[model samples]
Target: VNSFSGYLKLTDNVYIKNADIVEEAKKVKPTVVVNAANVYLKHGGGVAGALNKATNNAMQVESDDYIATNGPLKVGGSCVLSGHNLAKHCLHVVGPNVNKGEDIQLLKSAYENFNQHEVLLAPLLSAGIFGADPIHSLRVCVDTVRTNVYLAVFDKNLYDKLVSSFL
Candidate 1:
């Protein structure tokens, strides 16, 4: 197991971590890895961009196909695809572009939509390119879900800051 900057137990199985999302995903091999994206499934920024690179753009291809057939996904909507280079599966969620208070509800709905799995790896939803505060978004995730959730962070400094604030 990789040593993370910090860990928070939201429930018996759920956890929050300040570490490399991709590396942690490799370690946990969760049932599904959640990717926050726009309705167009554009994987051009932040975690979505990183995932697109890691999966050799397979995710983008899948997203394109899904959108071509089903139109754009709505906020709180999600789709599942085979994991090309990470977890067993990938749950692509259409997150709100703006960080309105309602985005938290959409985040919760995204979590609830995938609650059946044994484990889920997620980046802090709406925290990066979506413009929400990482700590606040993480709090919402912890508060909303009671499953095995692992939240990954990329920057050690930011990780330490969040650890100090939350712990």
Candidate 2:
């Protein structure tokens, strides 16, 4: 597996995960950090029919809040692409399967967090369960966030696409 390390800033500033560790890492200009596993892909390997329930939204976690109902990083909120009040705040966006402008729109919503100082800490593709290419995932992320992104490896093809479209 790839190494997941980076800083995650919160907009609401209420319950910051790994706050103590984050503070200690701040001594350096840049710090290496990692977050808990993806909430969506909590359930590991299985066939198309045998779905894992730990990561299943409908089965594992019951809720009526989600931004991009069909997206990878499922967050709580309306379809406006901003803070949804499911668990304080969350953002749902499209991913894995490319359905027209779904991916683009999801990135747009993710980038909106930057305005509020929210940065995605890791590559959404690293969640592993999704079947999309890493390059495509990273590109969509760059497109939406523009210059304000931090963390690990970024696919070159994705970066190029972001520049062509957003720049």
lDDT of each: 0.73, 0.31
Off by over 4 Å in 1: 1-10, 99-105
RMSD of each: 3.1, 11.2
Tens-place lDDT digits, model 2, residues 22-108: 222233222222221233523233211112122233412332232135544542112222111111222232233332222434444
**Which 10 consecutive residues of model 2 have the lowest summed lDDT?**
76-85
Against the hidden reference, what TM-scores do the models get?
Answer: 0.83, 0.32
Cα error, candidate 1, residue 138 (Å): 1.4
Question: Which pairs of residues collide in model 1?
Answer: none
- Residue 33 accuracy (lDDT) in model 1: 87
lDDT computed for candidate 1? 0.73
